[PDB]
Every structure is written in structure tokens, then in C-alpha cells.
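Q: What does the assembled structure look like for these inputs?
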Amino acid sequence: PRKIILDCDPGIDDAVAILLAYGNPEIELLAITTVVGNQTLEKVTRNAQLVADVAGIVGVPIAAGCCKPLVRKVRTAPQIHGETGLGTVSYPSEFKTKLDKRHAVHLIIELIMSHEPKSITLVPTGGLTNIAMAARLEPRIVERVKEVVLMGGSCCIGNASPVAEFNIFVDPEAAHIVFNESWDVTMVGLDLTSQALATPEVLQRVKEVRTKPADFILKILEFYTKVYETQRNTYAKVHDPCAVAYVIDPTVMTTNRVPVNIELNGELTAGMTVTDFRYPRPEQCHTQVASKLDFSKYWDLVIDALQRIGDP
Amino acid sequence: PRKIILDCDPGIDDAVAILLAYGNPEIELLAITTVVGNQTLEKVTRNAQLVADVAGIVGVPIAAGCCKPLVRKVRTAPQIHGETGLGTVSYPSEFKTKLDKRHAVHLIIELIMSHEPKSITLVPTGGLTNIAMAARLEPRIVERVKEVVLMGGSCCIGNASPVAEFNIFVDPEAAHIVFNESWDVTMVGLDLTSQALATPEVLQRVKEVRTKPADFILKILEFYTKVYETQRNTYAKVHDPCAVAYVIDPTVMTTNRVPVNIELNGELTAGMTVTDFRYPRPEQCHTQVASKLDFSKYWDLVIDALQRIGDP
Amino acid sequence: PRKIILDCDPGIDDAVAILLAYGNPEIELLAITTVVGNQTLEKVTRNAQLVADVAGIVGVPIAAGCCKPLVRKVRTAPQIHGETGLGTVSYPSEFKTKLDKRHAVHLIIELIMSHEPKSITLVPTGGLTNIAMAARLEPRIVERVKEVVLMGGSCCIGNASPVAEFNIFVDPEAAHIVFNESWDVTMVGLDLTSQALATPEVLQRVKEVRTKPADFILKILEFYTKVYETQRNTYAKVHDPCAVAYVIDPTVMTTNRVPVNIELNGELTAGMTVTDFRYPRPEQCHTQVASKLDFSKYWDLVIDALQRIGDP
Amino acid sequence: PRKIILDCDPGIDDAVAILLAYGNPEIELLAITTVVGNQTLEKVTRNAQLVADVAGIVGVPIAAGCCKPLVRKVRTAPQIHGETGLGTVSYPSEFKTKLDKRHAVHLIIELIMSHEPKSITLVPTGGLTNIAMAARLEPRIVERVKEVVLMGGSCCIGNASPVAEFNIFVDPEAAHIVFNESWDVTMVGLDLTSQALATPEVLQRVKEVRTKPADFILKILEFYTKVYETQRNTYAKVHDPCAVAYVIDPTVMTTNRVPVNIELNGELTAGMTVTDFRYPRPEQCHTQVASKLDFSKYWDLVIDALQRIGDP
Ligand SMILES: OC[C@H]1O[C@@H](O)[C@H](O)[C@@H]1O
Ligand SMILES: OC[C@H]1O[C@@H](O)[C@H](O)[C@@H]1O
Ligand SMILES: OC[C@H]1O[C@@H](O)[C@H](O)[C@@H]1O
Ligand SMILES: OC[C@H]1O[C@@H](O)[C@H](O)[C@@H]1O
Ligand SMILES: [Ca+2]
Ligand SMILES: [Ca+2]
Ligand SMILES: [Ca+2]
Ligand SMILES: [Ca+2]
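A:
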């Protein structure tokens, strides 16, 4: 199995990504680390604990990371994930899954420096603040990581701005750090995740798993669906598990190696992932961008993970 | 017929656009105005005169405009259009078509203020310097123009930069002026013109027109083809007549009304046409962007214009 | 005498500059051209006509120029010059001084191309829009002008922003055009004009000229004084005649030749005149920046001009 | 005495600042932390060890921090501090002063969280990378610090660029983090430190201390002098001890409370400390900028520290 660290900001689709990573046997989930983004750090961390309580995730540390972007002001997304960050779910008075005492940045560094070289894939699905901080605090992690597979970016059409995707937009400086390090980066951007639609058939399949964790996922996906239908005129785009799915089986999506850099100073374009598709593409390009999704394979992976989790 | 002013920087595809505008009976070509861009102003103006000499264009003033962009340094494209701006053609010792004494900006203003309101379409196919200058020198032209239909811009993939198209890139400030005036603007960008391919069948049809102007077009298109095949790994994209074709018959391409603005200060993205496709689109949007080309109709229009010009 | 074109946006200190240029025998005032800035173009043009009516200026064309900056939105300064642009003065039902039929940009070009080379100094005391437009529409004026002496800019402390001075701030693109042309430019910036204080002794000297034009100047300077005392905690800074004064007698101020460029894209610094005082200064630098004012000589020039105008 | 952490990049004037902090009895020097800047991190850290060996500094941890700026590329200053970072001094085969095992960022956080609140002043005299990293990794340090007194910035004239000072220029993002946190910041910028001249009388006083550490300081100051005389046409500006001197005795310099922010995106002005001196100044402004130096008091403090260190 592939060892990963899942760095996230749950977040309704982050929650699905946690359960895909936990339920799929090709993934060894070493840690869930949280970052400010969809909601404040306090809220997304509580949300990660709720997901772990729901699915019975034991032995996987949950560590809270950065509560602010590197440079820019905090921006949250309650219009998409709700004031709580998980729609209309309710919370227990106390969580079974306790928080790790280590800052996420410290846990990321410790895991990378103590595991064998080239064995851990970083899977960020929120802003890149923790990843950037870790890379600058312990530069030896950059060559030691297997690769980075992140949900974020967009070649053309944004969501947080006309041209920028939310995870990059909320911390462009951190994204610039990650994309300009020498490690291999796979950008699973909106071009790809716009295809990860929670169609009625998908929601029906989740309902038919017939477990409490699947009921939980269906509940938050039904909230997420109403927001996307109302605010965006589409079915809900379940972005973040696409990054975990690539690690499970890269044939779940096509990719193209192209140069990618992060715009920091544009008036209209700050937070854009600027991609260069012009001919010729440079050789030994360390960045690749995802393009076409195997829709059936993707949702089969999500459903299979929910089936394997069962009713803990 | 629709009256137009064709503002251009010939330029191999500009030359095709001149002949489409001249040969098609739905266009009343009022003037050919030139601007620095593909080559220096002196060269592109001589090239416009050569095209007029080749096709026997009489009674249409050719006026030279701005020799520098508004703010940024002159950038030419000899790697695409040759050191002369028209590939390997030869020039007569003297042109039959003489240059108008008026600066292009003055001719544009004079034509718009003397013709009936809402009767003239501006068709820019180079940098937007002359159009911007005219709008600022005589602001009354903005409401008097029928509309602006320009070749330029790109929603996603650029040519002059990863994300910017040449005509916008060479004078972003002038583009910002044009796109932020109240007149209707149709942006016939690279998304559209990347489909205007000079395939072998197209070049064969040009050869079979069997006229000296068609031979001229075939010659410059064969140069243009070798440059695109070598530098870009595609057939040649014959961009500029797409803007004239829209004026002839808007059903030759689909369009979408979306907000468009011009990035001026990005490190990576200066010169980008930033388009906002997010839902919901604003009402009464004064900009629209072209999307899908009717390939057969487009090339039929070009071939028909060459047939109608005949051998003058 | 030195021929000048005074390009301005009256504007209380512009009005003083008009009368200094008109009254001083070392200046041959060829034209008053107006630009949007302190107020709308309509208002500052009416204000120029009022100044000409008050002082009996005959045979000097007043031509209205650009009503918008090149790229950025119109910004006016009614908090400094009043809703009318001249404080609380009243206007006649009809002006004696009629407006020239030519756009200011056309008049500037015509004057420069018809007078002997190197004989006319351009003296801008508003935004640089007209000057930039003229330079781009007829590039031959750049080498034909004697030099440009402008009121604008600041090495350190701004007024319109922390670091930018108003005339540059309201059209940074036009300033960038002017400062990057090859002509000699003298920047009479806030470092200098902050010393041009209308102290009680100065206002007393204006009162003692005992003419109707001096009464007019005293009236607008008393408004200007109340605004500066209230909003800025200083006496009024009478900036614009400093540029005319340099043309009369360059020993009225010290200058330093240093590179100067215009910031266009900074979030905080757009509109800054970026000056490079670091050692070593380049040779044959075409820009110089004013530093120390001969306070007594400056106000003696203003008072002498008012005395020479007398009561027309 | 005032507890400080001296964060620095020795650096010839940093070396003087270390000895002022060590020798003056009003300072309790808790740590010397190093950052990339004047030279690579490896070199400036070795240089800090050499200074500690020369002056016999025991019981003060030296901890190496960040080897790269947050976002931008490494920039060093061998033209000012030499290829080694300390001019032409020689190095022992082994240092007596050993390096702390903790990263500087970890040591800064540990010291602030373990000492009483509001007892430690941070004194950065290099790029602000470590300070910014510490503030983001443990946000509780921001309210716990007494204040930040840094050498960096400039109101008007820069050194690394026309308008930017080196320490801000080499990591503008880190500076933006520091200046936009709620802690009190005193900016001891070039306006102030340009007055800290190593005149012949100053160098003579250093020579007359007649100790090996003073000989060391004289040697590096003589190199520093030759660089400033040759490259800058001034005596050497000994910047960094000015920040320590303010902590010893704030009356050694005047200050003004004014808003200060950091320009990140300007083409010409990135790295500028943008100061707002316009009237009125906001109340309870958390930033102040140094202005006039008590030259005699400043150099008396430096000489007295060298005398107190003696010959260890
Ligand atoms: O732009 C998509 C990203 O933004 C969030 O709303 C989602 O969790 C996802 O990571
Ligand atoms: O980017 C396409 C544009 O650039 C030029 O090379 C062509 O003439 C066309 O107008
Ligand atoms: O910044 C000074 C400039 O701004 C205007 O208010 C004055 O007329 C002057 O030209
Ligand atoms: O700009 C002055 C700063 O730059 C360095 O050269 C000095 O050590 C000082 O900290
Ligand atoms: Ca997420
Ligand atoms: Ca063209
Ligand atoms: Ca003015
Ligand atoms: Ca230093």
C-alpha cells in the first residue's frame, strides 16, 4: 500500500476523501493534518474528529496545523460548507478521537524524516500552508517525499475567482512554495474535479451502502448538492477524493506534464495556477496537471471504501 | 452590407482577412488602418499596400496608425510572419495603392463621426492601440460605433505567453481601454481561432481558385504553415479572418456573453483576457467570447471571397 | 522669452501658475490646455476661462483636452479645490474668453510642429494624459520639444497616497509614457513644492498688490489655506507655479539628475515616482528632480507677475 | 536588563551588533539566531560562531534558522560583506562555540513561551524569515513578545533597490507578516542608520580600545569601509547595532509613529517599506520609524561595550 499524509480542511468533500483514504486497502493513512480554509482551523479540526468518530478511525493521528495563511487574510467558505464546515450535521458533546499534541507541521516533518526515503506521498486537499511551512522549516523533506498529489488549481475556469481555485487562492504564497520545490507535483485541479459529479445515481449508490458512515456521507452530500444546485447550477463537484483516487490508481485520470507556476501579484489573477501548454513542453517537467476522469472507476472507489468501512 | 473599418498589422492572416473583407459582398470595407504588432508599423503598412496592389483594391484608404504601444515596449513576431511580415514574398519598387495622409486614429474618428450612428463595426485584428487612442481622443465614437469585433484574447491557452494572446499582450493597456468602454465587444480569441486550421484540403482549395491573388495567399500560407508545423507542431491557425467572418455571418461561430477584463499587473499573467464563466452570468453583459467554429462555413467564405476577387 | 504651453487642471494653484506665466516677461505663453484632474474637464476648463477673463488674457488659446485618464478611473479633488474647482468664487453667465475649437492634443502637436525646433517647453501641472497622448499620436514632437518641466511626483511622501503625488496618481500610465520618452524632464515634485508655503506674509503681499486679479488670487488662496490648515495641518502649498518659476529662472530651485520611473502595478505604490539616488548616478540622465526652493525669489516672481498684470 | 533575542546574518555590522548586545549591561542576550541574507546560512552561522569565539561568549545559544526566504530566491551580498560574509578574516579549524541543536524558529518559540509574558524583545537585523515563521507556527508568541525592534526598511532611499532596503528586499513576504502582526514594531531603517557612520574618529576610538575583539572589529570595519568608499562614495554605515542601541536607550534616536506596510507586488517597488506620514496619523499606531541618531551616544555605546568585553 501507498503511505500518505492527508492534509485537509473538512469540508464536505474532504470528509469523503478521508473515508476513501481510510477504506481503500491500497492506502496506508499515516496522519490526518488540518489547515484553515473551508472554515476556521478550530472548526475543520473538529470536523476531522467527527469524521474519524463516525468511521471508527483508530491509530491515525489527527494534528491541527496553521490557523492563518502565510501572508494573506483568512478566507472561509461557509456559503459552500456551512457555518460549521459540514453542513447541518450535529456534533457530540465529546469526541472519541482525541487530537494529537503535535502541530501538523511538526508531525509531517517527523513522519517524513523517520520513514524510509521516497515512501510517503503528501496529499493536500486544502490550502497549502502546512506543506509550505514544513518544506521551509525542514528542507530535507523535499527530496525525501515520494511526491505531492494535491487537489487544487485550475487551468482555465476558477471558483474562488474567475480564474483561481479556492485552495490556491486562500494561500497563493504557500502554493508558490510548493509548486517551485523540486519534488514531483500532480495538480488535480478543477478541470478534472468538475467531472466528479454527485449525480442522482451516485447518491443512490451511497444510500444503498446501508451503513451509518454512508448515511453520514449522504447527509453532507445532500447539503453540498443543494448549495451547488442553488449557487452554481450544477450537481455537486466532489473534488478532494480525486487526489486520493490518483494515489490508489493513477489510471483513474489522465495527466499532462506541463510547467505550472503560481501568480502572486495580479490584480485579477492572484492565486491562478498558470499552466504552459504551448509547444514544446520542457523535458523532465516536475509538475503534471490532471485532465480527464474515469467517472465510473472514481465512484466505484468511493463506494467500495464505504462498503469496506462497514458499520464500525 | 455591413460597413467596417479593418484595423490590422499584416501579418499573413491579416492579409487573408483583408481579402475576405474586400471580396465578400456583405462587407463594405471603409478603410484599412494599420498598427505596430506583427512587425514594425513601416513594414505592416507596406504589407497592407502590397495586399491592396495584389487584389486591385481601389477607393479604400490605407492609413498608418500608432508605431508604438501605449505604454509597453514594441514587440514584433518575425519568427511567425518573417522579417518582412509576409514571409518570403517580394515587393515592387513602388506601390500602386498610395497611403492616406491621415493618421489612422484621425481617419477612424472622422469616419465614425461622419457616418450615421450605429452603422460602422470596428474590426481590429492587431494590437488595440489605435482603437484605444481613438476612443480617448474622441469619446463620442464609443456610443456611435455599432460594435467592436476583434481577433484577440484567449480564455485559457495563450501564444505570446502561457496565458496571453499576442494582440492583447503587445498592448495590454490599449486592450483594457477597449474592453472597459460601454460599446459591445465580441472577442474572437484563440479558443475559436485555434480551430481555423489551414489543412491540406484548405490549401488545395486555395490553389484551385486559380488566380494571382489566390496564388499570393497560397504562397504566404505555405510559409505560415512551415512556421506553425516547425515551431508549434500544428497546422497554421488563420486567426484574423474569423473576426471578419463573424461580421459577415454570426452563425459561423458560437459565442457566450461573459465578463471580460484585461490583466495589467500580473508577473505571469499580464496581457491575459480574464473571463468569468462562473454562474450566474451578469445580465446585459457588453462582452461576448467566441467558442466553436463552423469550419466548413468559415473556409467557404474565404474561398468565395477569393473567387469573387478573381484576377483584377 | 521662453515659449511654453501650460497644460493644467485649474485648480487653485494652477490659476496662480497661469497668472505667473502670463505676467512674467520671460515667458511667452502660447496656449493654456486643460486636462481632467482636480475637477472634471468641463469644470477645470471653465475655471481656466474664468482666470483668463479675470486677468484679461487675450490672444492665448484655451483648448480642452482629455476628459478621462488613459486607463484608470476619473478621480477628482473637491476636498482640496472645492466642488467647482476654484473654491467659493462665482462665475459670470458668459465668458469673454472663448474656447479654442481644437482638442488640446491637436493644439499641442500643431504648435510644436509649426514652431522652430527646440523652442517650446511643455509645462504640465495636472495629470499627464494630454502630453502622453500627443507624444504617441505624433512621435516627432518628442525630439522637437525643448524640454518638459512638470509639477508632479514626489521622492518620498505623497498626498494622494502615502507615496504618490496627485498628478502622477490620477494617470500613472500617462506619466510612464512621459518619463520614458527621450526628452529632458524636470520633475518639480512635492519635495520641492512642500516649501512653496502661502504664509501670512505671502498672503499680505498678495493683498497689497491692490488689483482685482490679486483680490481673486487672495480669495482662492484663502479657501486653499483653510483646506490645508484643516485637512493637512499646514499652510497651503502652492505647487504649480513652481514649474513655471523654474522656466523663468532655474536658479529658483536646486535640482539633481537621477533616474526616475513610474510604478504602475504596486498594490500600495501605484503612481509613485520611483527615484534612484544611489551612487553612482548614470551619466547623461534625461530626468532631474527638484530639491530646495529659493522661497523669497519664488514669491517675488509671483508678486511681480500680479503687479505687471495690474488691473486690465 | 532587557532580555533580547538577536536574529541576524553576520555580516560585518551584525558582528558589531552581537558585541554591543553582549558587552552592554542593559541587555540580557538570550540567544543569537541566524538567517540567510548577507551570505548563505552556512556562512553567516559560521560567522556568528567566530564572533562568539573572538569575544568569549559562553552560555548564549547560537541556533541556525532558515536557509531560504519564504517565497523568493536567495540573494546574498558578497560585494558588501565579502565571499565569507566577514571580509578578509581567517577562520579556525574548529570553533569553541558549538551550535545549538534546535532550529532557530524552535528556539525563538521555546524562549518566548517559557519566559514571563512581555519580557523578551525580538531584535532582527537580517531578513525577517525566522521571525515570520515563528509567528505563524506559534501565534501565541505575538502577544507574548514585549516588542520587535528591527534594523530594516527605509522611508525614501534604498540600497538593494532604488527604494527598498536589503533586509526587507530579501524576504518581503516575511516582512509583511511581521509588520502586519499586532505586536509593537520599531523600524530602525536607512533614514536612521545612514547616520551611523564609521568616521575616521570612530575607527580611531575602536583602535584605542586595545583588545583583540576590538582589533577584530577594526579589521572587519576597515574592509567594510573600503567597500562603502568604493561602491557607495560614503563612509561605512554600521546599521545593525542601531537596533540594539534603541533597546539599551531609546533616547539614542528619535522615532515617529506612522503606519507602515510592505509592498509585495510592485515591479519597481517590491520590498519597499511604505510609510504614511500624511496628516492625520492614526491613533494607537503599532509601528514607529526611527529618524534622527544621537551620533555621539551611539558610538559611545559601541566603544563602551568593547571596553567591557576586554580581552577574554
Ligand atoms: O476548490 C475546491 C476546494 O475547495 C473546497 O471547497 C473543497 O474542499 C476543495 O478542496
Ligand atoms: O495571436 C493571433 C494574432 O497574432 C498575429 O500573429 C496574428 O496576425 C493574429 O492577429
Ligand atoms: O499634488 C499637487 C497637484 O495636485 C493639485 O491639487 C494641484 O493643482 C497640483 O498640481
Ligand atoms: O541594509 C542594511 C542591512 O543590510 C546588511 O548588509 C546589513 O547587515 C544590514 O542588516
Ligand atoms: Ca478541501
Ligand atoms: Ca493580426
Ligand atoms: Ca494642478
Ligand atoms: Ca544584517
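The CA atoms of residues 54 and 216 of chain C lie 8 Å apart.
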